[PDB]
Design a protein around this ligand. Structure first.
Ligand SMILES: *[C@@H]1O[C@H](CO)[C@@H](O[C@@H]2O[C@H](CO)[C@@H](O)[C@H](O)[C@H]2NC(C)=O)[C@H](O)[C@H]1NC(C)=O
Ligand SMILES: *[C@@H]1O[C@H](CO)[C@@H](O[C@@H]2O[C@H](CO)[C@@H](O)[C@H](O)[C@H]2NC(C)=O)[C@H](O)[C@H]1NC(C)=O
Ligand SMILES: *[C@@H]1O[C@H](CO)[C@@H](O[C@@H]2O[C@H](CO)[C@@H](O)[C@H](O)[C@H]2NC(C)=O)[C@H](O)[C@H]1NC(C)=O
Ligand SMILES: *[C@]1(*)O[C@H](CO)[C@@H](O[C@@H]2O[C@H](CO)[C@@H](O)[C@H](O)[C@H]2NC(C)=O)[C@H](O)[C@H]1NC(C)=O
Ligand SMILES: *[C@]1(*)O[C@H](CO)[C@@H](O[C@H]2O[C@H](CO)[C@@H](O)[C@H](O)[C@H]2NC(C)=O)[C@H](O)[C@H]1NC(C)=O
Ligand SMILES: *[C@@H]1O[C@H](CO)[C@@H](O)[C@H](O)[C@H]1NC(C)=O
Ligand SMILES: *[C@@H]1O[C@H](CO)[C@@H](O)[C@H](O)[C@H]1NC(C)=O
Ligand SMILES: *[C@@H]1O[C@H](CO)[C@@H](O)[C@H](O)[C@H]1NC(C)=O
Ligand SMILES: *[C@@H]1O[C@H](CO)[C@@H](O)[C@H](O)[C@H]1NC(C)=O
Ligand SMILES: *[C@H]1O[C@H](CO)[C@@H](O)[C@H](O)[C@H]1NC(C)=O
Ligand SMILES: *[C@H]1O[C@H](CO)[C@@H](O)[C@H](O)[C@H]1NC(C)=O
Lengths: 274, 246, 216
C-alpha cells in the first residue's frame, strides 16, 4: 500500500554499485594494453626488487603490495536481508594492471601514454626528467652512482614506515569501519518496539487475531522504513565523497604517473620526478 | 607554428608539411560526422541525464494514487463520503504519506544537482584551459599532446573537439648518453644522440630529423672518465673552415 | 556448541533465535535460515536474440531447484568457453558474458586487453618519423531542467479542509520551495559560468583564409 518505496531504494543502491565498478575501472584501466619487464634488469643501478611483481609467489603481488594487504558477524548480516556483491575486477587483475604501469613507466618514459610505447634506457630518461625542473643533464651522470644509492636506500626506509607502523594506512582503514558501522546500526534497528507491543512479526502474528494485528504491524513498518531510508541517504552522500576521491586519483595517475607534473605540491613535496 | 612549439617539435615541421597536415585535419572532421550521423550511443551522457529527471516526476506523480493506509486515494471522494469529525483521521494518513513522498524527491535533486555542479566546474575548467590556450596536463584536453579545441553547444550540455597530435612509425636506433671528443664530454643542447650504426646524429625527441654534431647544438662539462656509456667520436666545428677560406 | 544446564534461546549475535535446545529431550540444536538469493536475467538485444541466461546469485548449484558455478552464483544457460575476449555484459568476479557464434550466450574470463613486451636495451632509442592529427570528443552535462513544485496543491488538492490540517505541520513547504528555488538559480549560474567567459562577441570575416583548414 505504501507505493513504490522499494523500487526507489533498490534503484539507488544499484546505481551506487555500478558507480563503484566505474570508479575502480577509471583509475587503473588507463593503459590500453599489458606490458611486462624483460627478464634481464639493467636500469642503471636503480633496484626495483620490491615493487616489480615477484613470480615466485601465488599471486603476482610484489613485496610492498603484500605488506599493504597485511596491514589492513561477517555472516549474521547476510541472514536478515542483506548481501555483498563481489567486485568486477578481482585482486589478481587489479594487481596486473598496476604491473603494466610500472613496466611501462621504467622502459618507455612517458610516451606510452600518448601513442605507441617507445623504448628508452632508464639512465637516459632521468636526464630528461631533471631537464624538466631547471637542472641540466650533467648533474645526473656526474653523480649517477651516488644518486642510485640515494634512491635505493630510500626504498629501504619506506618498508619500515609500513613494516611496523600501522597508522600509515589510516585513510582506507577508516573507510571500512564507517561502512561496517552502518550495517550494525541498521541491523540492531530490527529489535526495537518502535511503539509496538513486540519486535518480532511471527510473535505478534501468532499472538493476536487478524483484525487487530494491522494496527500494531503498521507501527513496525513505518519505523523500519524510516530506518532504511536513513541508511540509503548516507550511502548516497558518502559514495559522493569517494567519487571525488577517485576523480582526484585518476587525475594523479594521468599526470604524476603518465608524465611529469609541474603543479606545485600535487605530485609530492618538492620538484617532482616520477 | 606556435602551438607545435609548445609540445617539443620545431616550427619547421609544420610548413614543410602544411598541405598534408590540412588534409589530415579536414578529413578528420569528415569522420566525426559519421560517428554522430548514425551512431546514436555517442550522446549517452546527456540522454542519461534527461531520463533520470523525468524518471523522478513519474515516480512522484504515481504516488498520488496510493491509499497510504487510508480508505481511498481522492480527497474529493473522502470529503463527500464522510462527516467533518471523522474525516480528519483519514486525511491525516494521506498528508503524512505525501509529505514523505515529496521530501524524498527533493533530497534526490539536492544531491543530484550537486553531481552536476561538479560537472560544470569541470567544464568551466576545460573551457578556460583547453579552449582559451594550450594545456599540458596529460590526458586533460585529449589523448596525446594537445593542440587546440572547439566548443559546440548541445541540449543541456556542451561538446568539445580535442584536436590532438599523435606519433606514427617508430624506428629503433643505437644511442649514447654523451660523446667525448678530447677528454671533454659533450651533451646535447636539446636532443638525443642517435646513430644509424654508421655515423652519429642529434635529433629532437618527437620527430626524426638528424643533424651533424656541431659545437653550436652542444655544450661541454668535465672530462670523459665519470659518465657511463660514453662513446668516442669527432665534433665538427664551423668556426674553423671560414678561417681556412682565407 | 555447549549450553549450561539453564540455557536455551541463544541469540548469539544481536537478536536472532540462533542455536536452541529442545523439549521432550535435551539436545543443543542449531538454526540457519534456508538459502536465499536474488535472481537476475542476462539477456542480449531483444531483436538480436530471445534466448536468455539466468544467474542465481550466491547459491550452490546443487540447490538450484548446463550449469556453471561462478564466484558470484550459479549461472545457468551459458557455455564456458576458455576463449578470452572483451567484456560485454559484466557478471562479476571476472566473468563477462556475450552473444557469439550456432548462436548462443557464452561466458568466460575477462581479458585485460592484449599483451606485448618491450625491446628495452642498455643503448637503444625509438624515434617516430610521422604524425596523425586526430579529433576526439568528450560530452559533458551542464544543467538539469529548471523545475519547481508548490506543496499545498500537490499535497492538498485545493481542499480548504486539507489546508487547515496542513498548516499545523509548521514551515515544511517554505523549506522545499526554498531548496528548489536555490537549485534553479544554481542552474542559471551554471549555464552562465561555462559559456560567458568571453566579454564581447566576435565574428569571422566574410572571406575565409585559414591556410587550407576547412571549418565549413
Ligand atoms: C636489490 O635488492 C634486493 C634486496 O631488496 C637484493 O636481494 C638480496 O640480495 C642478497 C645478496 O645477494 C641476498 O642474500 C638476498 O637473499 C636477496 N634477497 C632479498 C630480498 O633480500 C638484490 O640482489 C638487489 N639487486 C641489485 C640489482 O642490487
Ligand atoms: C677513446 O679513445 C681513447 C684513446 O684511444 C681510449 O683510451 C685508451 O684506452 C685503452 C683501454 O681501453 C688503453 O689501452 C689505451 O692506452 C688508451 N689510450 C690513451 C690513454 O690514449 C678510450 O678507451 C676510448 N674510449 C672508448 C669509449 O672507446
Ligand atoms: C606520413 O603519413 C602520411 C599519411 O599516411 C603519408 O602521406 C601519404 O603517403 C602515401 C604514400 O605512402 C601517399 O600515397 C599519399 O598520397 C600521402 N598523402 C596522404 C595524406 O594520404 C606520408 O607519406 C607519411 N610520411 C612518412 C614520413 O612516412
Ligand atoms: C567545408 O566542408 C563542407 C563539407 O564537406 C563542404 O561542403 C560541400 O560543398 C560542395 C560545393 O563546394 C557541395 O557540392 C557538397 O555537397 C558540400 N557537402 C559535402 C557533402 O561535401 C564545404 O564546401 C567545405 N568548404 C570549403 C571551402 O572547402
Ligand atoms: C649509416 O649512416 C651513414 C651516414 O653518413 C649513411 O651514409 C650516407 O652518407 C651520406 C649522407 O650523409 C650519403 O653519401 C649517403 O646518403 C649515404 N651513403 C654513403 C655512400 O655514405 C649510411 O647510408 C647509413 N647506413 C648504413 C650503411 O648503416
Ligand atoms: C623496434 O623493435 C621492436 C621489437 O623487436 C619491433 O616490434 C619494432 O617494429 C621495431 N621498430 C623498428 C621498425 O625499428
Ligand atoms: C517424556 O518424553 C519422552 C520423549 O518423548 C518419552 O519417551 C517419555 O515417555 C515421556 N514421559 C512422560 C510421558 O512423562
Ligand atoms: C556444493 O555442494 C557440493 C555437495 O555438498 C559440494 O561438494 C561443493 O563443494 C559445494 N560447492 C560448490 C563449490 O559447488
Ligand atoms: C650493453 O650491453 C651489455 C649489458 O646488457 C654490456 O656489454 C654493456 O653494458 C653494454 N655494451 C655495449 C655494447 O655498450
Ligand atoms: C535492435 O536494433 C534495432 C536497430 O538498430 C534498434 O532499433 C532496436 O532498438 C534494438 N533493440 C535492442 C537493442 O534490443
Ligand atoms: C575448454 O576447456 C576447459 C578445460 O581445460 C573447460 O573447462 C572449458 O569449459 C572448455 N571450454 C570450451 C568448451 O571451449
Amino acid at each position: 500500500q505504501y507505493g513504490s518505496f522499494c523500487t526507489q531504494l533498490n534503484r539507488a543502491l544499484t546505481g551506487i554499485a555500478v558507480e563503484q565498478d566505474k570508479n575502480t575501472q577509471e583509475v587503473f584501466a588507463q593503459v590500453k594494453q599489458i606490458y611486462k619487464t624483460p627478464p634481464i634488469k639493467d636500469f642503471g643501478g636503480f633496484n626495483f626488487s620490491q615493487i616489480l611483481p615477484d613470480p615466485s609467489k601465488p599471486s603476482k603481488r610484489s613485496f610492498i603490495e603484500d605488506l599493504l594487504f597485511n596491514k589492513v558477524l561477517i555472516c549474521a548480516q547476510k541472514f536478515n536481508g542483506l548481501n555483498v556483491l563481489p567486485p568486477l575486477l578481482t585482486d589478481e587483475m587489479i594487481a596486473q594492471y598496476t604491473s603494466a604501469l610500472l613496466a611501462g613507466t621504467i622502459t618507455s618514459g612517458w610516451t606510452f601514454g600518448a601513442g605507441a610505447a617507445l623504448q628508452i634506457p632508464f639512465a637516459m630518461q632521468m636526464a630528461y626528467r631533471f631537464n624538466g625542473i631547471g637542472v641540466t643533464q650533467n648533474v645526473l651522470y656526474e653523480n649517477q652512482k651516488l644518486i642510485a644509492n640515494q634512491f635505493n636506500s630510500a626504498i629501504g626506509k619506506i618498508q619500515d614506515s609500513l613494516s611496523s607502523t600501522a597508522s600509515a594506512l589510516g585513510k582506507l582503514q577508516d573507510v571500512v569501519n564507517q561502512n561496517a558501522q552502518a550495517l550494525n546500526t541498521l541491523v540492531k534497528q530490527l529489535s526495537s518496539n518502535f511503539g509496538a507491543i513486540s519486535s518480532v512479526l511471527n510473535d505478534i502474528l501468532a499472538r493476536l487475531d487478524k483484525v487487530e494485528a494491522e494496527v500494531q504491524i503498521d507501527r513496525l513498518i513505518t519505523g523500519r522504513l524510516q530506518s532504511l531510508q536513513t541508511y540509503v541517504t548516507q550511502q548516497l552522500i558518502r559514495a559522493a565523497e569517494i567519487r571525488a576521491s577517485a576523480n582526484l586519483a585518476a587525475t594523479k595517475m594521468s599526470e604524476c604517473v603518465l608524465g611529469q607534473s609541474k603543479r606545485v605540491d600535487f605530485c609530492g613535496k618538492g620538484y617532482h620526478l616520477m | 607554428a606556435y602551438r607545435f612549439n609548445g609540445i617539443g617539435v620545431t616550427q619547421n615541421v609544420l610548413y614543410e608539411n602544411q598541405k598534408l597536415i590540412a588534409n589530415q585535419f579536414n578529413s578528420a572532421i569528415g569522420k566525426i560526422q559519421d560517428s554522430l550521423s548514425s551512431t546514436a550511443s555517442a550522446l549517452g551522457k546527456l540522454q542519461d541525464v534527461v531520463n533520470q529527471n523525468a524518471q523522478a516526476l513519474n515516480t512522484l506523480v504515481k504516488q498520488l494514487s496510493s491509499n497510504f493506509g487510508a480508505i481511498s486515494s481522492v480527497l474529493n471522494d473522502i470529503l463527500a463520503r464522510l462527516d467533518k469529525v471523522e474525516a480528519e483521521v483519514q486525511i491525516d494518513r494521506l498528508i503524512t504519506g505525501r509529505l514523505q513522498s515529496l521530501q524524498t524527491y527533493v533530497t534526490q535533486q539536492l544531491i543530484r544537482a550537486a553531481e552536476i555542479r561538479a560537472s560544470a566546474n569541470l567544464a568551466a575548467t576545460k573551457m578556460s584551459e583547453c579552449v582559451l590556450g594550450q594545456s599540458k596536463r596529460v590526458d586533460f584536453c585529449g589523448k596525446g599532446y594537445h593542440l587546440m579545441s572547439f566548443p559546440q553547444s548541445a541540449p543541456h550540455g556542451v561538446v568539445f573537439l580535442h584536436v590532438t597530435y599523435v606519433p606514427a612509425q617508430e624506428k629503433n636506433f643505437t644511442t649514447a648518453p654523451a660523446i667525448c671528443h678530447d677528454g671533454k664530454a659533450h651533451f646535447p643542447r636539446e636532443g638525443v644522440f642517435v646513430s644509424n650504426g654508421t655515423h652519429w646524429f642529434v635529433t629532437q625527441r618527437n620527430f626524426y630529423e638528424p643533424q651533424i654534431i656541431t659545437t653550436h647544438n652542444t655544450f661541454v662539462s668535465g672530462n670523459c672518465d665519470v659518465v657511463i656509456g660514453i662513446v668516442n667520436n669527432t665534433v665538427y666545428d664551423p668556426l674553423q673552415p671560414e678561417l681556412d677560406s682565407f | 556448541k555447549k549450553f549450561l544446564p539453564f540455557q536455551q534461546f541463544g541469540r548469539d549475535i544481536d537478536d536472532t533465535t540462533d542455536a536452541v535446545r529442545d523439549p521432550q529431550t535435551l539436545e543443543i540444536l542449531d538454526i540457519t535460515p534456508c538459502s536465499f538469493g536474488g535472481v537476475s536475467v542476462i539477456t542480449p538485444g531483444t531483436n538480436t536474440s530471445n534466448q536468455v541466461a539466468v544467474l542465481y546469485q550466491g547459491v550452490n548449484c546443487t540447490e538450484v531447484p548446463n550449469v556453471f558455478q561462478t564466484r558470484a552464483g550459479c549461472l545457468i544457460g551459458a557455455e564456458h568457453v576458455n576463449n578470452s575476449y572483451e567484456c560485454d555484459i559484466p557478471i562479476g568476479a571476472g566473468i563477462c558474458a556475450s552473444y557469439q557464434t550456432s548462436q548462443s550466450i557464452i561466458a568466460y574470463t575477462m581479458s585485460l586487453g592484449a599483451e606485448n613486451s618491450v625491446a628495452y636495451s642498455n643503448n637503444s632509442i625509438a624515434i617516430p618519423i610521422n604524425f596523425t592529427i586526430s579529433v576526439t570528443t568528450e560530452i559533458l552535462p551542464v544543467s538539469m531542467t529548471k523545475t519547481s513544485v508548490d506543496c499545498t496543491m500537490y499535497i492538498c488538492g485545493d481542499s480548504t479542509e486539507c489546508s487547515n490540517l496542513l498548516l499545523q505541520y509548521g514551515s515544511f513547504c517554505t523549506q522545499l520551495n526554498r531548496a528548489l528555488t536555490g537549485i534553479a538559480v544554481e542552474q542559471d549560474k551554471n549555464t552562465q559560468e561555462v559559456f560567458a567567459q568571453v566579454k564581447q562577441i566576435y565574428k569571422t570575416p566574410p572571406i575565409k583564409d585559414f591556410g587550407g583548414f576547412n571549418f565549413s
